[PDB]
Structure formats: C-alpha cells, structure tokens
Amino acid sequence: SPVLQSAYDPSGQYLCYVTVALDKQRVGVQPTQRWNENFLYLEDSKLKVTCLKWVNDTVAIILGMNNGEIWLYSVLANEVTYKFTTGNSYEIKDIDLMGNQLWCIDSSDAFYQFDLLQFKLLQHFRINNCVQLNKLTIVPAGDSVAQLLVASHSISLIDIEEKKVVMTFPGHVSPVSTLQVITNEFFISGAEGDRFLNVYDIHSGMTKCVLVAESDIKELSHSGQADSIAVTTEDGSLEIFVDPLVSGNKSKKSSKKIQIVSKDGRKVPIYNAFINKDLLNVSWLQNATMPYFKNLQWREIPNEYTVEISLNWNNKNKSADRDLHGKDLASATNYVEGNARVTSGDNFKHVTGTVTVILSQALQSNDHSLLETVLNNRDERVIRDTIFRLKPALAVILLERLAERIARQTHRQGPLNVWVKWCLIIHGGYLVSIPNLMSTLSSLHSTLKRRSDLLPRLLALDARLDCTINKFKTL
C-alpha cells in the first residue's frame, strides 16, 4: 500500500495520511465527505513518521516519529507550531493525547508526559518487566489520566500514580497492532498479521469474547457506544460486527462484509474505515496517492456487499471540442448524397413473312438475347404485319421492353420509335380497356416525358447556333 499511516479525526470529517514522495515523506489532510494540494514535506530523507493522532484553538495533529521529537502541526496553516523533544534520540512507537497530557513510548520503554499549555516535559519515567513496549492507550475514567494501558506482545495495565503494573493479560504471539479502549470495562487488542481480536476486561482480566475476521487485521475503528466495530483487513475489505458484547458464543465472526470492486472486474484495496451512528466512511486510493471516500448507511446493507465505483479502466477519451470522430460540433456537417436513389416526378410504380411467334416466344419468356434478333429488322411493312398477328396481352409486355431499350440506348430512338408507334395503333382498342395505364406503361411515359422537356433548351441552342452559322456563311 502506498499510504503508510492514516488516522481519522474524531467525529469523522478529515484524515491525515502520510506517504512517500521521492523518498521524502509528506503529510496531507483531506476532507472525507464533500481536490487538495497542501502538504507538509519532511526536510530530511531519513526521518519517518511512526505514529499519528489528532487534537480536539486551531485543529492540530500530532507527529511522534523517528528523529526523536514530537511535532505539533496545525492543519489550517501548513506550519509546525511546536516540537516536543524527547531527551534521548529514539523513535516514538505510539502517542496518545487526552486532556493536555500527551503520552508517548520511547523505543527503550521510557514513558514521557508532555503538557500542551506549558510546552514542557513532565516526567521521563521507566518501569520494569516490559523489555519492549510499542502501543499505548489510556482509559477515559474521567478527567484523570491514571492507569494507562501499554502493550507489546503482551498487555499490561500500568497505574501512573503508584508507578506500577496493576494487572497483566495473556497477549498474542505477534506484536500488538491495534489497542483501543471501547467502553469503560473492555478494550480491544489485535496483533500484527493475526485474524483475531479480543475484548479483554480491564477489571476481571478474563476475555469477554474473541472476534475473528476472515483475513489478517490492519486497521480498526469503533463506535462510541460499543455497538459496532469496523475493522479493515490487510488484503482490502471491511467487516463490521454488530453488538460485539452481546451473548459461536466465544468467537464471533463477521456480521456484515463490505468490499469495493471496480466496474471492470478488478479489485480495489480498502484502508482506514470509519464508523459512527449509522454512518460508515470507507476510504480507498483512486489514483496512486489521492484518497477517495464514500458515505453509506450500513444497517440496510445486506450481509454481503460490493460497492462498485468507476475507474477509467478502458475509457475512451471523449472531448468537449471534438465530436465522436475528429470533427468539431461547430463544424457544419456537409451534405453527402452517398447511395441515395434519385428518381423523377413522373416515374410511376404500382400507382407476308412475319416474326410474330418468335417475338411472342421472346416475350412470354424473358429472353432478351433473342428479342434483339427479332428487333434487327427495319422493313416497315413487316413491322405492320407483326403487330397485326400479335397477342394483345403480349403487346403490353412489348411496350415495357421497348421502353427499357429506348431509355438505355438513346441512339436507338430511330428504329424503335416506329415499333412503339405501330403497336399503339393496332392494339389501341385493347389499351383503353386496361385501366391502370400509368402502372403498365410507366417506363414508356417516363422515357417520353423526359425526352420531350428538352425541346425548348435544344431549340435555344439551335437558333443561337444558326446565328453564328449564318454569320460565317455570309462572309
């Protein structure tokens, strides 16, 4: 994970998260409800942030870290206000602030107490029987600071006033990662790389119950009334147990599960969830460092849930200027005729040695390779005698075939004009009887009307031809 440590404020409005930036750590605060560009860089490439906490008089976060000092950094102005200096030079494993009494752990087990109002160190103070200590929380017994908990691979409650350990607890085989008090009598404890959480009693010493996850445990947050514990696992998911203190009996599994899976099918890791009164704030990394958030009511959500978000996995880059393909949208789309059918306004559509028998055979069948052989003759008396002994039903077919040849071949308007003339004369009586003449002779009527409207244009060319012809015939 690119984010090393992230801590929520109380009541859930911002988080301060630390990250690597060209091997120089930087801390930034992001709102979680609703971009940002304000960070604090660490000026040395060795010193690294180890532990983090908020302060509830501008809002300030606490940076106890590797170099030995504890930084107090105001969120609103990117400036550290004060640095609390540990007398030795050791990293600070954990911090806590309740009241004005900040408490921290040295790497060499030395407790320290710091005052906010006086900016002073109260008591450098060591103990026995705890050779390693890495996590501390204090109890909210009142306004007092007494009986802080401290733990590393075993848990010990230690009273400040008598400077002694009160009661130990059987800890975990790994070092403890999460150690938070929840109510006044139970505190959660979780190791590193362990899928187990225990609510140990602060007075009985016996564990009330144990909370198991599905995977190893990284981050934890809890509601103030101990009804919900929201634990973020390491692999990236979120489990929420409802009423952990209610009465398997000894081990309680995950009540509800929340994962975040992107729309393309890829999985998205989860870090640092937050819970409140009916409010959950799951956090994840949209880009490599930029954190994205989502508020969601978690009681109506079923026992398994996948929040789906929109990563630009294979997104085509639409542009405001560009259309779907190259051009602009203020570019006027030019007219293209393309494959458009072009018609006319007259084209109706469903609105003595003769050759008669070889023409009637060539019209009953659609044998155009033989109709032309019949039509090669130009002896006009034969043309009269063929239409005389022609079937009147086949004459309508003859007019359609003659019309297609005079339309296609404009040079064939010579001989075929006497063929259509002789046919309309002989079978004129039958042609009145058939009513849909615009349907039948549509090819004939369209060819004739198109060849007849040319005439004023051809006459205009001819007399203008004859002006220049008579100009040079005279001289």
């Binding site: 060209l22 490439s45 880009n287 490599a288 639409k318």
Partner: protein, 349 residues
C-alpha cells in the same frame, strides 16, 4: 523496486521525465503509451496510463510554467507531424500541435523536441517554448500554448542535438541561450531572448560524429527551477560523440576562450552516446549508451573520474535507452529495451 513492476510496458522505453515538484515519473516508448507512475520507495503504482492510437512516443517531457505554477503540461511527440500536448476526473484534454504556422518544409518529424522557457523582454511575461529539429539545420521554436511559430534558427551541416542554457541578467529577468551542434562540432550559441541571432560559434576539440549535448549544473530543460528567482546559469557543458567519448567544458572558460580546451575527455564508454544527463546539483554526469548491455557510466564532478564501485557486473541495465534523475530525491530511473524502468537512489543526496 522498479517503477515498471506495478504494470509492465510492451515496447522499449524511449524517454523518461520526472515532475519538477511532484513525485511523478512519465514513461513513454513505441508502445504509444504515456504511463505516469508514482515514485514511492517500496511500492510504485500507476497514476494514469494514457494510450494514444497510432502515435509512437520517442520523447516525452513534463513542463511547468514559471509564473503560473499550475499549468503542468505534458508534451509528447514522435515520428509523426504532430506533437500531443496533455494538460493537468475522467476524460483527458489532449491537443495536437499539427500546425507549422509558417513552413512545414523543414520539420517533417517532431521526434526531437526539448521544452524550455523564454522571456518576452518587452514585458516580463515568461512563457514556455518548444524547440524542434528540422530538415538540415533548422531548429524551429514554437510557442508552448498558443502554438504560433515564434522564431527559427538554421545551423550549417546536420543538426544532431540541441540544449538550452540560461543566463540571469538582472532582478527577475533572464536571457535564454540555445546551444546547438553540427556533426563536426561547430557549436552555435543563439540568443532566443531577443530576435534570431548568434552570440558565439566555436569548435569542440574532436567529436567527428556527435550525438548529444547536455548543458547542466544549474537549470536545464530536463530539471528546471520553479520560478524566475531560482533560475541559475548552468556551469558545465558536455559534448557527446558517437565513438564513445564525452568532452566536458566548464562554462567559466568556455564562454571566454572562443575555441575552448576540454577539461577532460572521458573514454570509458565505447559505443554511441544515447543520453547525457547532469544531476540537478551538478555533481554527477550520467553518460549512457544504447548499443550494448551495461552501458551506463557515472562520473564524479569536478574530478572527471568514473566511479569504480558503480556500476558492477551484476547490475541490471540492459540496453540503456533513457535515464532520468530526480529533482529532489537524488533518484535515478534507468530504462531498457525490455521496458523495465529500474530505479536507484544516490544516498548522499
């Protein structure tokens, strides 16, 4: 950990760049991809990965304006007639610089570009410029955002490289000097602050086939400053050959002698020089060749001595095609023909 280990490329990495303020490595190659990674210490990740269609990427550098400090354009080009400019949700604003406003006869290819800044000197309106190689001698200078052809200088012979040197004259005012080279070594120094002219021409002692010039030690086109106050004159000038030699010139006597003697002629690379890059402090010059495996040589400056313990016979380099420094962290991102940008850290910085 290598920066390409989060998501591998598919072609040879052809150019790298680091963001002048942000942690951001931009990788581009013949994959037609601009893969912007984040640079952690342990876990690098993709910030974004823009794939142009049909447009190979040979050079890709970031650019931040001096005055605005908020534009953060990404310029990429290739063996085409266009240069894709990427600005800095869901979509991406990518305009193409496919318009030579005066003449397309010279630069029919955009693949050799370097982005610098320039001052108007009538007003103090600093703005970016892009400089492009051309047909024979033509280095053409265009406006970075408006796209207008600003000016154009022609050298004799064949261009092989060009670099840009700055010179702060007075308070908040600096003159940009373009240093361009012939194949022979006829290094020209144009003054882009005023109109197209020459400050000086001279001769590199040697360098029969020259590949690269990098002017470093201060503000350069690869690792610039962020404001007019921090713009500093470069202190050294490196002239790289094709026979492996690199001739260094200190600017304190190269601007005066007018036929300057090289300080030292480094010889430890054999094949043709593909990259000369100076550290932003100016103390490590990285010469890289691309015709053989393990062709990286770092030289201590000003001792002009190659480091003995770096690199060894067990370092992963491959055919080194593009090297990148870091402006703050002292990091060194080195490409290869396998498309695995491998990342090192100089621990003194």
């Amino acid at each position: 950990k290598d920066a390409n280990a989060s998501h591998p490329s598919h072609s040879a990495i052809q150019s790298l760049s680091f963001h002048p303020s942000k942690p951001l490595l931009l990788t581009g190659g013949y994959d037609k991809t601009l893969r912007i990674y984040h640079i952690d210490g342990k876990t690098n990740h993709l910030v974004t990965s823009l794939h142009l269609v049909g447009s190979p990427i040979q050079t890709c550098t970031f650019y931040t304006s001096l005055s605005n400090q908020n534009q953060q354009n990404i310029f990429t080009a290739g063996r085409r007639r266009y240069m894709h400019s990427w600005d800095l949700s869901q979509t991406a604003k990518i305009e193409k610089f496919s318009r030579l406003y005066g003449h397309e006869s010279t630069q029919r290819s955009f693949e050799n570009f370097k982005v610098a800044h320039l001052q108007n000197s009538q007003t103090n309106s600093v703005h970016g410029i892009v400089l492009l190689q051309g047909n024979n001698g033509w280095i053409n200078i265009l406006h970075s955002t408006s796209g207008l052809w600003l000016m154009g200088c022609k050298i004799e012979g064949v261009i092989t490289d060009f670099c840009i040197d700055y010179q702060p004259i007075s308070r908040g005012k600096f003159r940009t000097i373009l240093i361009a080279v012939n194949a022979y070594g006829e290094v020209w120094e144009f003054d882009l602050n005023k109109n197209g002219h020459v400050i000086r021409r001279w001769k590199d002692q040697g360098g029969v086939g020259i590949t690269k010039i990098q002017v470093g030690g201060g503000t350069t086109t690869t690792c610039p400053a962020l404001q007019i106050s921090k713009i500093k004159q470069n202190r050294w000038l490196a002239v790289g050959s094709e026979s492996g030699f690199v001739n260094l010139y200190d600017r304190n006597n190269a601007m005066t002698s007018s036929t300057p003697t090289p300080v030292a002629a480094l010889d430890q690379l054999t094949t043709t020089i593909s990259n000369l890059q100076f550290s932003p402090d100016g103390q490590i010059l990285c010469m890289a060749s691309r015709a053989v495996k393990d062709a990286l040589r770092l030289v201590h400056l000003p001792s002009c001595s190659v480091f003995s313990n770096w690199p060894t016979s067990g370092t992963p380099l491959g055919k080194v095609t593009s090297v990148a420094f870091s402006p703050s962290g002292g990091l060194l991102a080195v490409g290869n023909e396998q498309g695995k940008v491998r990342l090192w850290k100089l621990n003194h910085y």
